[PDB]
Amino acid sequence: TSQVRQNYHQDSEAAINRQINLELYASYVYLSMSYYFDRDDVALKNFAKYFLHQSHEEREHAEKLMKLQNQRGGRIFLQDIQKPDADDWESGLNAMEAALHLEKNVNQSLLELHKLATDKNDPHLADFIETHYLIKELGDHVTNLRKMGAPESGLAEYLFDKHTLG
Amino acid sequence: TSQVRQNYHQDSEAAINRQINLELYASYVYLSMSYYFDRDDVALKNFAKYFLHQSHEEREHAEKLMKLQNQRGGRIFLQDIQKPDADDWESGLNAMEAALHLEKNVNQSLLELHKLATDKNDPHLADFIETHYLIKELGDHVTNLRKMGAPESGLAEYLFDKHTLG
Amino acid sequence: TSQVRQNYHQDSEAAINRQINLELYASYVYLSMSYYFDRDDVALKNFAKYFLHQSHEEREHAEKLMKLQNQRGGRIFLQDIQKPDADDWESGLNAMEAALHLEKNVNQSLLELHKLATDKNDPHLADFIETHYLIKELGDHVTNLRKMGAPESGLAEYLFDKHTLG
Amino acid sequence: TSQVRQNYHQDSEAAINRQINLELYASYVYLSMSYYFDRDDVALKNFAKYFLHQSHEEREHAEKLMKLQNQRGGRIFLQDIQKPDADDWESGLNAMEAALHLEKNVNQSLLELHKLATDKNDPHLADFIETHYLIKELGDHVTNLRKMGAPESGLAEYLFDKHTLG
Amino acid sequence: TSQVRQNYHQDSEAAINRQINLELYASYVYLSMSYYFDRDDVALKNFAKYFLHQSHEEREHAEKLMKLQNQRGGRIFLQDIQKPDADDWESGLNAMEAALHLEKNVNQSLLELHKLATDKNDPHLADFIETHYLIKELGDHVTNLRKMGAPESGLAEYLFDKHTLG
Amino acid sequence: TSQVRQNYHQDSEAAINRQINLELYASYVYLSMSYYFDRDDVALKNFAKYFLHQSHEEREHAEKLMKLQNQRGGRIFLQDIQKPDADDWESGLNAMEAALHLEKNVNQSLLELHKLATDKNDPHLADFIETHYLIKELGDHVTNLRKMGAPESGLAEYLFDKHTLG
Ligand SMILES: [Mg+2]
Ligand SMILES: [Mg+2]
Ligand SMILES: [Mg+2]
Ligand SMILES: [Mg+2]
Ligand SMILES: [Mg+2]
Ligand SMILES: [Mg+2]
């Protein structure tokens, strides 16, 4: 056992690992989205940039949670990073929608983590959920793209790319 | 009675107070509008900013009129600030229209104040109506949004947000 | 229902709204105080400034809680902002005392909000109570003004105005 | 009773005081360590500096908790600061080990404080445990010094002094 | 079929995808190594940094090859990113050795890609193998750590961490 | 015995230790005073600052005397730091008076140390009493606060706080 471990639950340890995998997965999703929009037959440079940045942000979450497991005296175990549910993301609107679904799910996993912490009386971990959320952020992007007429309007997706994401 | 009072009418004093309440009310209207457009299902960031600024401007009017009442030797009395006539402002165009109606009304109250001053031979107060008006300003915004096709066109409200209000 | 809502309680939604009204009310109280002290027969410029700043601070709280309701997928509903309990605040000491009573009350409402969050297992909201309190701050001002001899000593209120609030 | 007190428990008040004494004690431990290593027959300048800094950090914790007790309307009561468990700290490795034991103990006292807060529904205090911990930090130093061959290797303690602590 | 495709082989397309997966995998290996050395019971900060940088470098390769597939008119298909062959990397020397084995393997896959290009007369792809290799770089690190006495000498791994990787 | 010891008396060694404890004690007294005046029902910010600085100064003396014991080849032994004679310091004037009594006592202990040095023909130690005294400094503060009417005059303590200590 670790010298620096103290009131860290064996189930807390496993919960952390699951989230790490979870956050790496979201990073892969956003990576896959980004290069979809880099395609010569999709060609939305700012979507591509936008999701490429969100890919970095989630990999950074995984690293924070890795920096957790280690700080708390636990042991990092890494699983396969499963490939995303799509190769073709169809439209900017569709990816924005998929990303909204993904983040709500990731958030739900964090709420569970936070509950487990509370019930194991682990206040340092409940705080390590040091988030600030982009759920509204994609929320907003989805609303706008719909009102502009996406995805049937190809003008809509093109402009939003220049004006909101530019 | 006040040492610094001089040719300030008891009806002038009450008229000022009514306007103060009036100007605070307009500030609340613009506050309520601003956060309507901050909604994830409305998502017009620049409307939101625009009305949030107009909220500050009207609260500032109220403070000028408060700084009046006091300067002139009168006594500030504050009423309830009644909540706006809507929670849902429907569209950017609709708020712009509502705001136009509101400002014309507030202006009408100022003209009455100015008349009362003139008939009480109160030249310092008639001047304290030191305005410069945004009635045309919303006038212009309304015209444009209509010609673009609001509110049926969701593209129209989105672009105007970026281009005129940006 | 909202796309960005998730584990936000309908009673959480109403609780937020009550606080918003509550925080706007405190802003109105401090506004009313400020211009009391701007009176030619009270004439404490730094009290006036001091409470005018606290008015801004509370309106800013209301806006943060508005920025909440919206982020969480809830719906802002605004009530009347009821006028303060006084027009005449009597003395600097008396306003400082009234303000202390007001802030303790507002704080009590926040503790209730925080409890409700905890019992609805709403960790994002319990944190949104991102305060740092001025209860001691008026606490200190009250102690000093009393020891100087307020409000019977008119010298006391005048000096404190220059020295602590200057 | 205090004007600025509100939902602060009499047992919360005593718990704070115990921690204050606790944190001052850790400061004395690190002070005693620092000047051990300043000895002409120990002569590890960077250990000496390192623990002298940690002495400042803990005295600073005590002051934060003092600034608590006062803010919350409670009353500071100070006990004797008991002298450390050693005059001779033996080796750099041994002090690092002792310090690890000390910090885990101090941390355990904080977890208890945090629990008490939670059970007294005192959210402002549970947060005032605004830490970020050096338990891993000495954890790391201990691991390295062991692998280098401390304390039998006098070369090891000398180099680590220059290279990790320099 | 794509408008911008020209002399890009369907087997060239699949070969690219395999390499992308390959390069992402190496990134995961270096990520897993980095946080191994961030452990309180391993505690080699500069190994940790070193492999964390190499993680970034390989993810960057994957992105270049993604930027390929797309440029050439092909279609990106992403597989699972399989978790590394170890959780415990044992020593700095052992990871350096594992990383050497990994890079030789990745290099072998690139030589095959380059051969396939040549035999499909695909000169733009044979060039896209725009590398400059760190095989010698870990080669050198391995030689030094061995000569210092790794991994039995814990002094050796500690110093190399400060002196070569610092 | 120490290699760097020379004409340092075993009674000189014990005398130093007593002073170290003595100087740490004065630091604790000034710490306890400082946070007394930080109380919401005392609220003299500049007293609080003033004594907090004097706390730092005395802890610094202790460290100089520690840096002595070590330089001279002696051995530091630390006792309990006994808690001050008061929790409630009553008034600014009263603390200033208590502090004057404390410093005269600490000074008397230094004169004894200096005598012992002289009689043991220890000129390096008699010099290490490298002081410059604040006995007059509190002397002056006491005189002023009395003439202003402390502690019955609460105006007096408040002004002196702003004007002499500001
Ligand atoms: Mg995330
Ligand atoms: Mg107006
Ligand atoms: Mg507030
Ligand atoms: Mg501590
Ligand atoms: Mg590579
Ligand atoms: Mg002294």
Residue numbers in the entry:
A (entry chain A), B (entry chain A), C (entry chain A), D (entry chain A), E (entry chain A), F (entry chain A): 5 to 170
Extract from the study:
As a standard structural component among protein nanocages, ferritin exists ubiquitously in both prokaryotes and eukaryotes. Structurally, the 8-mer protein is a heteropolymer that is composed of two different subunits (Hα and Hβ) that originate from the same polypeptide. We have described here a protein-engineering approach to convert the 8-mer protein assembly with C4 symmetry into the 16-mer, 24-mer, and 48-mer protein nanocages with higher symmetry by controlling the intra- or inter-subunit disulfide bond.
To this end, we made a mutant named Δ3C, where two cysteine residues (Cys90 and Cys102) related to the formation of the intra-subunit S–S and another free cysteine (Cys130) were replaced by alanine (Ala), respectively. To obtain detailed structural information on 24-merΔ3C, we tried to crystallize this protein and eventually obtained qualified crystals suitable for X-ray diffraction. We found that 24-merΔ3C is composed of 24 subunits assembling into a ferritin-like nanocage, approving the above hypothesis that the deletion of the intra-subunit S–S bond of NF-8 leads to such conversion. NF-8 has the C4 symmetry, while 24-merΔ3C has an octahedral symmetry, so this fabricated 24-mer protein has the three C4, four C3, and six C2 rotation axes. However, the superposition of Hγ and native HuHF subunits revealed that a shortage of an inherent α-helix in the middle of the D-helix is lost in the Hγ subunit. Consistent with this structural difference, we found that the stability of 24-merΔ3C is lower than that of wt ferritin, namely, 24-merΔ3C can dissociate into subunits at pH 3.0, while wt HuHF disassembly requires at least pH 2.025.
